[PDB]
Amino acid sequence: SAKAISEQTGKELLYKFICTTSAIQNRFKYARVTPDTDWARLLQDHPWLLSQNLVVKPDQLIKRRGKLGLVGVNLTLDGVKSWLKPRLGQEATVGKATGFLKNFLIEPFVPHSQAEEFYVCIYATREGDYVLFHHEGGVDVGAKAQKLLVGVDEKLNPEDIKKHLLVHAPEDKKEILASFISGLFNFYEDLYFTYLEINPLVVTKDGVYVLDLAAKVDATADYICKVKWGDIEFPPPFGREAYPEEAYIADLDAKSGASLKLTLLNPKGRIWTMVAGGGASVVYSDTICDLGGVNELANYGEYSGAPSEQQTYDYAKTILSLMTREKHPDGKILIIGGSIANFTNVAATFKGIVRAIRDYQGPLKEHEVTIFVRRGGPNYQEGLRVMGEVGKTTGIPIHVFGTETHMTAIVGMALGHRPIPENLYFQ
Amino acid sequence: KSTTLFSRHTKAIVWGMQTRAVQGMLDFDYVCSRDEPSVAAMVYPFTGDHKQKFYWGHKEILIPVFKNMADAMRKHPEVDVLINFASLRSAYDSTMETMNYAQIRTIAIIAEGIPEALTRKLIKKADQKGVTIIGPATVGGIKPGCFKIGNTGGMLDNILASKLYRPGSVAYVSRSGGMSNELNNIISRTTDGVYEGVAIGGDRYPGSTFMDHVLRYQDTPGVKMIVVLGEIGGTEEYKICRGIKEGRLTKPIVCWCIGTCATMFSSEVQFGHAGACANQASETAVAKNQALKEAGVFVPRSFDELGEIIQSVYEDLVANGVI
Numbered sequence: 001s002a003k004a005i006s007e008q009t010g011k012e013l014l015y016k017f018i019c020t021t022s023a024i025q026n027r028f029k030y031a032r033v034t035p036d037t038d039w040a041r042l043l044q045d046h047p048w049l050l051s052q053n054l055v056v057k058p059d060q061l062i063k064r065r066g067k068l069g070l071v072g073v074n075l076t077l078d079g080v081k082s083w084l085k086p087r088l089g090q091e092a093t094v095g096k097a098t099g100f101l102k103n104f105l106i107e108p109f110v111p112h113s114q115a116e117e118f119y120v121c122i123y124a125t126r127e128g129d130y131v132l133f134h135h136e137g138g139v140d141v142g143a144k145a146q147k148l149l150v151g152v153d154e155k156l157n158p159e160d161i162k163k164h165l166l167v168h169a170p171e172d173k174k175e176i177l178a179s180f181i182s183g184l185f186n187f188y189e190d191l192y193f194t195y196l197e198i199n200p201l202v203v204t205k206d207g208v209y210v211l212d213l214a215a216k217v218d219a220t221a222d223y224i225c226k227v228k229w230g231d232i233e234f235p236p237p238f239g240r241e242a243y244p245e246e247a248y249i250a251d252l253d254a255k256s257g258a259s260l261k262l263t264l265l266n267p268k269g270r271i272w273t274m275v276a277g278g279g280a281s282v283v284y285s286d287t288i289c290d291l292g293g294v295n296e297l298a299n300y301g302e303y304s305g306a307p308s309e310q311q312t313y314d315y316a317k318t319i320l321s322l323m324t325r326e327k328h329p330d331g332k333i334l335i336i337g338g339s340i341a342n343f344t345n346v347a348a349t350f351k352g353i354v355r356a357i358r359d360y361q362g363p364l365k366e367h368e369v370t371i372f373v374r375r376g377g378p379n380y381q382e383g384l385r386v387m388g389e390v391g392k393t394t395g396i397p398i399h400v401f402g403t404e405t406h407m408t409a410i411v412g413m414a415l416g417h418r419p420i421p422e423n424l425y426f427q
Numbered sequence: 428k429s430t431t432l433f434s435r436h437t438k439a440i441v442w443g444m445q446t447r448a449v450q451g452m453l454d455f456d457y458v459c460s461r462d463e464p465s466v467a468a469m470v471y472p473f474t475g476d477h478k479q480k481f482y483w484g485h486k487e488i489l490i491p492v493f494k495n496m497a498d499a500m501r502k503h504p505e506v507d508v509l510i511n512f513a514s515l516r517s518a519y520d521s522t523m524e525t526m527n528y529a530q531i532r533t534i535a536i537i538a539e540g541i542p543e544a545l546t547r548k549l550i551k552k553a554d555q556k557g558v559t560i561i562g563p564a565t566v567g568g569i570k571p572g573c574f575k576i577g578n579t580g581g582m583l584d585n586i587l588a589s590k591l592y593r594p595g596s597v598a599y600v601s602r603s604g605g606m607s608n609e610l611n612n613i614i615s616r617t618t619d620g621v622y623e624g625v626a627i628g629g630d631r632y633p634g635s636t637f638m639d640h641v642l643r644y645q646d647t648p649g650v651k652m653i654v655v656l657g658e659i660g661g662t663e664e665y666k667i668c669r670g671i672k673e674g675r676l677t678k679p680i681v682c683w684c685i686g687t688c689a690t691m692f693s694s695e696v697q698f699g700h701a702g703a704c705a706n707q708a709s710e711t712a713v714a715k716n717q718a719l720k721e722a723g724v725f726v727p728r729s730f731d732e733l734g735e736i737i738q739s740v741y742e743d744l745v746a747n748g749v750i
């Protein structure tokens with residue numbers, strides 16, 4: 001999938017790799033600050049922070065930071081530290097997401113007129129990449145920009161840009177704008193971006209300044225692009241944090257053609273899922289939330305693509321570790337679900353889950369974990385047997401269902417909407 | 428592009444050393460009473476020209492494995508389909524190369540993880556040549572009585588359970604592979620069963636879209652109703668709404684889009700499919716389901732009522748002699 005990169009990541013890549021005739025100003029002049037920053041050392045590394053006034057703003061995939069009072073403009077370093085005091089380390093809500101402001105960027109302030117702000121965007125679609133230009137960049141950008149489709153095999157030369165896109169642009173700026181945009185588009189293509197927006201791009205008598213950058217890259221292109229991407233980082237959306245379990249599962253997912261994916265939504269949630277399949281895992285999630293349980297849904301997660309019994313054990317062990325971190329009055333629930341697999345060996349996979357339940361049987365009982373299983377596919381009868389079997393041999397209560405139960409029925413069960421029909425067990 | 432992709436005479440080349448998926452195809456072939464195996468040959472660059480054992484019913488038989496695609500093509504000019512199990516790294520190259528062979532009219536691309544910029548190029552060239560791409564990142568699809576892409580529909584016991592050995596009147600298209608086998612199961616329990624089912628895969632730019640297949644189905648007289656399992660992400664499903672409004676789509680369509688839960692999360696969550704990400708409000712499952720409903724599409728309240736509305740539409744089609 002396409003994954004957002006931080007402003008800092010994108011800007012370093014552009015500063016490294018863009019080819020233009022433009023003089024791009026202030027290359028690599030940015031500093032990163034967190035609540036743990038050693039500011040003496042920061043200023044040892046970035047003496048330019050004293051050389052002129054500054055801009056400070058969070059770099060956490062927050063949009064519309066200016067409208068949120070989250071861009072500090074034309075400040076002395078001391079003014080920056082004052083601006084950050086009520087912000088850095090504080091909880092903040094943006095839209096409907098709540099997170100800590102913990103990662104900020106400081107850059108030279110760049111004096112300019114509003115007539116020197118420009119909007120540029122490039123984004124991918126089925127038929128190619130659209131390139132947007134407007135001579136009214138800035139926070140009030142608001143079906144008014146020039147916009148050009150570049151086809152899948154088409155090239156974008158400065159000459160094309162002046163022609164299609166720069167019609168409204170100051171004549172003296174056309175050459176440098178065209179050069180920069182052609183370079184940006186080449187950069188965009190070579191590094192497998194899918195979205196790249198610079199708002200604003202500034203062009204003064206002294207050259208081209210990139211004041212803001214938002215971008216997504218196609219993370220599947222790592223095998224092509226790793227030399228240039230380097231150790232590229234894909235930050236969570238604002239509102240979430242990253243857990244080593246997620247990074248752990250991800251490492252598993254990168255080693256085989258099997259898909260293994262974990263996202264923690266609410267670690268304290270009492271409703272856990274270990275579902276097979278992209279679509280199915282979505283559907284169960286849909287159902288858990290259609291039935292009111294969104295606040296208790298702990299994770300989005302799916303295995304699939306025929307994971308081995310070992311891969312399956314290591315997935316399940318992570319889930320079972322994360323739902324036995326903290327008890328809950330009403331206990332916990334685990335939804336081990338899926339469609340009727342096409343080729344995943346249910347018996348091999350559930351034998352991995354069983355062994356993980358077996359290893360965590362003690363904790364699972366002490367958190368009052370109740371397990372519901374529904375599954376089809378190759379060898380699924382032997383899959384179900386071994387789930388029922390570990391259920392007895394540990395005292396845990398496991399309710400095992402097959403192709404005869406509707407896929408999501410088990411969720412209504414696990415939440416009390418409907419009774420548990422023991423007349424479908426193992427069927 | 429085309430309306431018919433597969434028949435009981437379809438012959439395929441499999442790219443890759445997938446003896447389990449090929450055997451499962453031949454088992455499907457045998458109980459569908461096909462005259463001949465659906466896999467004419469396999470290409471594997473990692474080995475030289477040889478022969479693999481397979482079972483046609485109880486009889487051991489031989490499929491030729493080629494190192495070079497150009498040999499396999501030249502020897503088996505009856506092949507018009509290729510099922511590409513190449514890993515993500517190789518899939519682009521081998522798929523471009525397949526489309527240098529005019530005999531190939533359909534390609535299934537199994538691999539997940541192909542960069543979107545490459546899939547777009549595949550699409551430009553497929554569109555150029557009239558070639559139908561199913562995928563990437565898909566298990567494939569199944570045409571009961573006729574042909575099965577790879578692992579689709581699993582082993583024999585499931586083919587028999589869901590009556591995928593003969594066509595009914597219900598076609599479907601899904602983004603999800605595993606859920607396509609659930610649809611197989613639901614449709615076969617609520618109707619006379621599947622006529623044809625295709626998983627278009629989860630990628631941002633699928634090689635063939637929902638509307639691509641919805642139209643094929645509208646023009647297949649064996650097809651009397653159509654089921655679509657949509658998904659949050661992109662705006663494809665709206666083309667269905669258009670196709671009814673324009674009078675192009677007349678057969679009843681049932682449809683449900685998964686990913687409604689995303690509306691309730693306080694932050695963006697990337698689901699398993701690479702395309703299952705809404706970038707504007709209209710791309711949400713909830714918006715899409717609601718627009719389908721107002722356009723004349725039969726939309727259940729939740730996936731839980733999916734089986735019930737399918738059956739509802741099917742029964743009315745029988746009552747009025749359409750089936």
Ligand SMILES: Nc1ncnc2c1ncn2[C@@H]1O[C@H](COP(=O)(O)OP(=O)(O)O)[C@@H](O)[C@H]1O
Nearest residue numbers: 055063064065066108109110138139199211212
């Ligand atoms: N280095 C800078 N020099 C001068 N003005 C700046 C600088 N960085 C940002 N600005 C101004 O602050 C506004 C808000 O900044 P921006 O980085 O675009 O954040 P957002 O787009 O999230 O509001 C911009 O429209 C621009 O006018």
Ligand SMILES: *c1nc2c(N)ncnc2n1[C@@H]1O[C@H](CO)[C@@H](O)[C@H]1O
Nearest residue numbers: 032036037038039040041042043045
């Ligand atoms: C980088 N810059 C730092 C400042 N200014 N304060 C505290 N820690 C800083 N780091 C960390 O040190 C590592 C290099 O030794 C960096 O990778 C960063 O984690």
Ligand SMILES: O=C(O)C[C@@](O)(C(=O)O)[C@@H](O)C(=O)O
Nearest residue numbers: 304305341342343344604605
């Ligand atoms: O295990 C499943 O239910 C899904 C899957 O592994 C399958 O075996 O059908 C595959 O379709 C996928 O989801 O990638």
Ligand SMILES: [Mg+2]
Nearest residue numbers: 259278304699
């Ligand atoms: Mg998948």
